[PDB]
Structure to design on (109 residues):
RNA sequence: AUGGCUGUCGUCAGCUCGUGUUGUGAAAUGUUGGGUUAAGUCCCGCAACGAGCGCAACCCUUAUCCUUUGUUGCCAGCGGU
């Protein structure tokens, strides 16, 4: 069942009321998530996620921070899988048709 | 009442657009920020991504050197004084 050795929870106060259902925490000012509920979402997650990787995988691994950027430009970068490892230029989906040519310049370059 | 022309802030760094986003809306963002430039100059940052007019460059001149050209210009090495 549990696979996350030391991923436990995180984040002291700064919590978000909406995150009670998945919190069982306490230990020292910072709450532990609900290890026993995290996983039941690897079900459904990787499921409906796989259920469209076969329907034809088009993903986009959004993840940024000089502390994980290329730990995402990884076997994630590789497969049926796109990504963004730095500042997410805003409107890049909603303005893909202005940005599409921001690509044409990348390649032409 | 005007065309054309001209002073002027000021060769100051400014003025805008599309698309995206935001607000009920006038509008906003972009162009609020951190540096730096002569500069909206540039670099980082950034719900914006991109662009046009201005900044800059392309023009004249000046400072070095090469090619060509030697009269009306030049005289280094020559012969004539
Ligand atoms: Mg400019
Ligand atoms: Mg100019």
């Amino acid at each position: 069942m549990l696979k996350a050795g030391v991923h436990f929870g995180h984040q002291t106060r700064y919590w978000n009321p909406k995150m009670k259902p998945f919190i069982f925490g306490a230990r020292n000012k910072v709450h532990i998530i609900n290890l026993e509920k995290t996983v039941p979402m690897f079900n459904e997650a990787l499921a409906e996620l796989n259920k469209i990787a076969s329907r034809k995988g088009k993903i986009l691994f959004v993840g940024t921070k000089r502390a994980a950027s290329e730990a995402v430009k990884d076997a994630a970068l590789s497969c049926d899988q796109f990504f963004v490892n730095h500042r997410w230029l805003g409107g890049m989906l909603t303005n893909w048709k202005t940005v599409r040519q921001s690509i044409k310049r990348l390649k032409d370059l």
About this structure: Residues 87-92, 94-95, 97-99, 101-102 of chain A lie near RNA strand B (CB under 10 Å from a C1'). The radius of gyration of chain A is 18 Å. The first helix of chain A runs from residue 35 to 38. DSSP finds four helices and two strands in chain A.
